[PDB]
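Budget justification note: compute hours in this period were largely spent on complex prediction jobs such as the one shown. Inputs:
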Amino acid sequence: TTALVCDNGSGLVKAGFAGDDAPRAVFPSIVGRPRHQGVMQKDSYVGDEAQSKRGILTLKYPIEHGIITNWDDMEKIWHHTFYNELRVAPEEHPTLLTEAPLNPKANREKMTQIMFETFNVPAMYVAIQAVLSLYASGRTTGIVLDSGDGVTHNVPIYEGYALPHAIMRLDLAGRDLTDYLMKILTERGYSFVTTAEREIVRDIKEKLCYVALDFENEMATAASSSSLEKSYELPDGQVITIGNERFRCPETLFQPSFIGMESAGIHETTYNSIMKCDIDIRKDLYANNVMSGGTTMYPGIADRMQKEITALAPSTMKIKIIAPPERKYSVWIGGSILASLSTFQQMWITKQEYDEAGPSIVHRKCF
Amino acid sequence: TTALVCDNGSGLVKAGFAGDDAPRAVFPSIVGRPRHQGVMQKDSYVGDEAQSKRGILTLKYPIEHGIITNWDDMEKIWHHTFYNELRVAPEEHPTLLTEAPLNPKANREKMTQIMFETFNVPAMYVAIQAVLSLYASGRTTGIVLDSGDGVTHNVPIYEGYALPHAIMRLDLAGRDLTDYLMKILTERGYSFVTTAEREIVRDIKEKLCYVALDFENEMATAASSSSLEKSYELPDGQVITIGNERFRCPETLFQPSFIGMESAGIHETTYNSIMKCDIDIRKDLYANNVMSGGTTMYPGIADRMQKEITALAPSTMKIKIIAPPERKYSVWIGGSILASLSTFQQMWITKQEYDEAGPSIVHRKCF
Amino acid sequence: TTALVCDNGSGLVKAGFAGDDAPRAVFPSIVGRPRHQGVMQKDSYVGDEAQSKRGILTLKYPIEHGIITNWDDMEKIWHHTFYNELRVAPEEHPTLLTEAPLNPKANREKMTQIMFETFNVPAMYVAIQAVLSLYASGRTTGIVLDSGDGVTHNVPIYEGYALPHAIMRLDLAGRDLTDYLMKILTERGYSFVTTAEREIVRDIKEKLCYVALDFENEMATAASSSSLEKSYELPDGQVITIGNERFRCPETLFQPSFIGMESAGIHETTYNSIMKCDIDIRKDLYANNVMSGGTTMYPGIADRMQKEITALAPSTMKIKIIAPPERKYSVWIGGSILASLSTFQQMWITKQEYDEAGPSIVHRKCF
Amino acid sequence: TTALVCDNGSGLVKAGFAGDDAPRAVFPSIVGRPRHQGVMQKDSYVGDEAQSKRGILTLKYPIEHGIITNWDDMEKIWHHTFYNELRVAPEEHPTLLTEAPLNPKANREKMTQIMFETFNVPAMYVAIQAVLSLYASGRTTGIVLDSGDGVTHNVPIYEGYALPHAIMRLDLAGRDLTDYLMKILTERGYSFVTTAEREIVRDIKEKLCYVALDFENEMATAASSSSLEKSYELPDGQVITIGNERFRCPETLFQPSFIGMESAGIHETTYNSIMKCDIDIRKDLYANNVMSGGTTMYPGIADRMQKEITALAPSTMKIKIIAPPERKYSVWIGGSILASLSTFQQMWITKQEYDEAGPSIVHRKCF
Amino acid sequence: TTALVCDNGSGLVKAGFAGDDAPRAVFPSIVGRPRHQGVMQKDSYVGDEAQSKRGILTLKYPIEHGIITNWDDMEKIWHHTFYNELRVAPEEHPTLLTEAPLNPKANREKMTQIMFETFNVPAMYVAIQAVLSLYASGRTTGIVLDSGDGVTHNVPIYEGYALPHAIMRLDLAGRDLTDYLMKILTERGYSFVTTAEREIVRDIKEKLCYVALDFENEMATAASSSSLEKSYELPDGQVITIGNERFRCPETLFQPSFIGMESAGIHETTYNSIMKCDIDIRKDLYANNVMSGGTTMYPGIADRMQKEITALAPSTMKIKIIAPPERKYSVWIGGSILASLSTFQQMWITKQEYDEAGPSIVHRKCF
Ligand SMILES: Nc1ncnc2c1ncn2[C@@H]1O[C@H](COP(=O)(O)OP(=O)(O)O)[C@@H](O)[C@H]1O
Ligand SMILES: Nc1ncnc2c1ncn2[C@@H]1O[C@H](COP(=O)(O)OP(=O)(O)O)[C@@H](O)[C@H]1O
Ligand SMILES: Nc1ncnc2c1ncn2[C@@H]1O[C@H](COP(=O)(O)OP(=O)(O)O)[C@@H](O)[C@H]1O
Ligand SMILES: Nc1ncnc2c1ncn2[C@@H]1O[C@H](COP(=O)(O)OP(=O)(O)O)[C@@H](O)[C@H]1O
Ligand SMILES: Nc1ncnc2c1ncn2[C@@H]1O[C@H](COP(=O)(O)OP(=O)(O)O)[C@@H](O)[C@H]1O
Ligand SMILES: [Mg+2]
Ligand SMILES: [Mg+2]
Ligand SMILES: [Mg+2]
Ligand SMILES: [Mg+2]
Ligand SMILES: [Mg+2]
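Corresponding output:
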């Protein structure tokens, strides 16, 4: 049987069969529960059902910053992924799961236990997202800036060797930019407070927000013109209108101090990840920055990333930012390649081998 | 045995057997007592007998604004409902009673005690009228504007969940419009003063009154034409003739300030009930306004309700007012459906369980 | 023992035993005393003896307008009623006496005292004449126009409830029409002056007088033809001849201004009695006008009464005047029914109860 | 010129000049017409002339229950008010007329037309009687119980705002108590029947009748003593003597069921008028009951009114009944104040403005 | 001249002169307008005048949730604050205004424009309420839980640095607890509906309501004893009696789900505000919770707040809740300190500087 590839991100579940070139099931990775008692019935809703029904539900994300915080809701979301969205018996297919680097070891151990004991999967693996995202680009060398809903991380790879000491990780990604857009929308007098209202602010961010190429020149232009200012229609048909908020939101990727986060931005953390590498590989990394995940989808993000890294880099270096179309799925496409390589079929952790060695056996290639 | 469904409204008793699609007994819910001593004998008359005999009687309504104010007259009206109008032993049939939301808890408790101890009913329930009225329409989602003789209330329901915080209630309905029509009839020189004369003014209201689509354009037209002006023949064969009074009466549903009532009208209280709901359900509520009860029967009431809510609503929303024929009975038809559902037979409060838990057990699904 | 029923009217005593359908004793209710001394002996004559002997007597009526004005003559007339005309021991039979409404309370009290202390009657009652007259018709609803020798009164009754506030009473009846016929006979040159001559004018009225259907068309016809003109033979065999006097007399029932009486006529007082009633009963009263007593016996009185009330009534109403044959006795026939009802035997005022409670006990159902 | 103030009540015309503190002309408001033809001449008499001459006249009141029922007799009574009793050219003085609340609109319209077109008055107003009666007391807040010959009405006013929804009106006042005293006088054997005899019964009521503080204790005392029993001398010098009739008459203000009137009495209608008001003003109304008009003049009426309202009121409230001396004129004194206020001269409806706007302009402050 | 300090809260205006230790003017911040037309005059009433007169008025609050929704009513309330309650020329005194955090920027801009252009104030500032409330306590470090009529917000401050990212704001405060107490009073059969009746429910809440230390043990005790049950006398002297309603009301601060509000309660939002802070300051915040504003005045609120935060906190931490007497004014007392500091006189926005820089200049220290 062909393998399942389940990217299982913190803000979308992306799942499908290895060798397909887009995921079959892509759904919100939310569990919702009724706020109000029924008078007229399903206790909880998962994914797109909890989006369609979201006004009456509190929405929980069981994954935050790539760490599974509620396990019973994650077992619901996996159960729906296999039985309802893929419509597959999971005990017949090896499943390539996926994780961020530098997660707690217990997160991978308890995930592996749930796969072998609840779902009875025959064989399993857990890849690092930014390794897979490099397979999707075809490259063997590059520094992969992957930024999802939960985590941003740089993994530098050179000719197929990882550099574990150079892996950087930011707990700043799409959800922290939703939580910040809600605060700067509050300055126009738009108040969003419910978990179900944050799912509206997310669609605002996904439609209206872009990256300013020169932040303080856009701040001047929005302070002098309403050409930057656009409108958006709520599910109620009320119309909100937002201005410099359109680029002040993604700017928080480059100035995390906006959210009170003491950190380098994604430019300085990418340059620092490059600078922790040996001088000889550094030129090959500069020419192969690979962007992936949804938070790299903002209009003009690569165009500014190139000009910030060019400003940090020594001026002889060619800086190139490889941000392909469909970089939103490149972690899943990379896993869909990997799971179908003949060289990889050696690496599946088999059920027998997990019954033998226990949860020790799961970190054999782990960061 | 099949259940009894007793809508037991403040201005009509509607009662029958579950699974029938119209009530058997529909009678005025009045107790009358002789004003004059007999010289020529029944101490009190109930319902249609107190209408036929009404000239010699003072008529009391034992229910006002959905609250049972005289219990001995309510025990008379129930006794006649069971033994004379349905001709049924009540101790053999479970009875679905009915109530407005936000009534005093003691009203339901003392009603339940009278059913279990006087009439010895085997099992009982008390539904909210606007839940039932949604079952009658078949819909699982909508905002139900129910307006009887005593109470107007909006109950919003979304996919079978109630939203208790959004339930609105107006103490303004058909009886307050009778009491106001008597005052504006007094301007033509028609004086109605007796309780038995108000039962004439009620039939005037039920026959001649309609809703003006543009109130101040009808007020101009009645100020310039006698095409709006109609006549009506009293029980004495005297002829009265009424003009802008025909629409100034129901207008008090939309401008309660006419009766010195500080309130939103039924349009603004329906829109406010919609606006207390989460933005996601709001579009589904706008398309499913359900009208019910007798005070929604005026010609053109839905046609104006649609155009007032369209004026408050944001202009992208489809506004639809589902006002079916027989909406005068839809509370009873809803209860006649509910009482016959297999899923509902779990919910009957049994006599044994009331002897066990006391009047605590009666509010388990209550607003 | 069976009860005595004594109608004891102001111009005839009608008396008999309950359950008979005509009175046994019907006699003039007159006491006469010799005008001239005897030379050739009874001091006073009562009833038919004072009619046979009337030329030598002054005739007194002890009742005027239903009020007993001379009590010693009323005790004579009762004594003759019991001992000579019925030939009954009064102390063995309960006696249903009778009265007009709105009489002085003392009239009923002193009548009751005379029955309990002179005649020693065991039990007694005093009914209102127009209640009894409705029992005679069998009806439970109607407005009873009773017109005797002394009083005209309307009592409206609806389904066995009296309406005390709507009871009307006219001090205009058969004796005032005798006194007016004597004045308009004086215009033909016939002078009647003695009390014994008024008993001739009464028989003229009872034989020749009728009700004109259109008074001023009969006045024209009598002014142009002697077809309306009839003759009558006195006890002396002298012949008098009377013309428009035949209908100008009863017309005084409809235009009391002829006798200088400021009043509505019997049509307008019947319509006014109907109009003091609640609108709901009014239609049932219009269809059930019941005529009774001797002054309703004129030819064509119901035929004009119907056409005057039809002229006052609103044109949709059915007006019907129930004037049966034997309406001259219907007060007595009603009392003869009432006294024989089992439900009524509760109501006799017993001698013991009068000795206990005094003359307070006599007005328990009184107008 | 100073204004005329014409209270124009249903049982007295009270008229005078604004700024005087008692009316000049106070006369019966009666038109009388000869019952009998002249043989020895004025066709009709008005006011005090129709009282002095009343034995030969039928007396009509052109106003009944505050509604002008005969307009030609009302134009006679106004003509005599201006030309004979005030001796004034009406076309030189603005006239403050007066009305009850809740009268037919046509009554005020036809009154205004008669003033502008027959009498040619320059400017006119029509005040509500119970507003004026509050100006007479000086108070800005209170509930005014005004009871005349035709109407009783409560108008609650709080700090100079009327509460139209709380205005109560009873068609029960001094004339209905004359018509009831004639019926209970008939129980002593005194029969009053002529319109001119009712003007005797009125003076009996005005002299002998009082309010019992505890009705059934006075009924017991009159049933046991002749200390409550007084005598009165007719215009014929005949002496009548009346007992519990002295207080059973005014008691009909508190138990209207005595006249077959289904209603609250003046205590319960005053308390109900207070209870239709918002809770915050209610304490200020309880302390400021203002009595006015002639039917409040009975000895002890305020003393019982205070003790009935104290019995209905919640026991913490101070109840005070402000019944001043000269409350018989306080409607006219209030109008005499109002007409002389500078702030009021804005409000006169001018002849020019009535020719412009028609009878629409007359209800600008109307109930 | 000394500065004015105007706290200008959503439910009270508190105003005075800097350096005084209690405000001079404290008044309701209400504008009321007559519901009824005058017949006997001020178009609108402000503050304590609209409380004294409230029965006849609709009351509007121009501030809701700290946002000024009606500007013309806010200009009335400021005009009365300066000219009538303080009796001061505002153009001679710099005025420290005040605001909640995270308000719309336009609210502060339009407030500043009204001060500089209508009232012509020479210099102005707008402080954050929870900064001021810390100055009142004297502390330089603490987390300030301020809860007024409109907003609850936590502002954590450490040694005089704010932590903008940790500022939490709840749209749940005293007015939402009045609106909820009206709904749970409706369960005893007490219906409060008018805006003027909500001002009665507010005084019920302020007198009878307290915080249960163990909510479900008080719910059991009130379900078993009437020792928790107290009575209160309306302005009408009617007596209402309320039981578990006394603590179910304030419990909505801790379980907002009672009002259908998806939120943490004030305990969990205070703990979450502490947890968004860096670990080193967290111990210093736990020992310095500062309570302020009126909704913290309930008996026992600090005693439960301490025991909920102790339950969330890690057990080694000292938790202390600094809830001083007069915490109801501590925002104003803090502003009265701040306005008198010499170091602060640098910070006044001068009129000249506002004419120069425009409404940009107003957010220089803003959240
Ligand atoms: N086109 C877009 N523009 C901006 N942001 C986006 C876009 N698509 C997704 N995002 C944001 O990125 C996150 C989803 O990224 P994704 O890579 O799907 O996450 P995951 O790795 O959890 O699947 C969300 O925060 C979403 O708001
Ligand atoms: N066809 C009609 N048109 C207008 N009003 C009506 C009509 N039918 C009933 N009503 C009014 O509505 C009330 C009766 O409504 P209903 O729904 O039967 O009340 P309940 O819920 O008490 O049974 C009465 O006030 C009646 O006057
Ligand atoms: N057939 C008749 N036609 C006209 N008048 C009659 C007739 N019979 C009796 N009356 C008159 O009516 C009165 C008697 O009526 P009646 O009902 O017998 O009186 P009472 O009620 O006193 O018995 C007398 O005035 C008599 O003249
Ligand atoms: N002193 C009095 N005692 C009792 N009743 C009186 C007195 N004065 C007048 N009335 C009665 O009140 C009515 C007159 O009241 P008034 O206020 O003058 O009426 P109007 O408002 O029509 O002028 C009449 O019915 C009269 O009988
Ligand atoms: N002693 C008290 N007990 C309970 N609640 C109170 C008390 N005093 C005021 N409140 C409530 O708190 C709010 C007023 O708080 P306050 O701090 O004065 O508000 P603002 O910040 O708007 O001035 C009102 O809702 C009032 O009902
Ligand atoms: Mg991902
Ligand atoms: Mg109903
Ligand atoms: Mg008779
Ligand atoms: Mg008057
Ligand atoms: Mg505040």
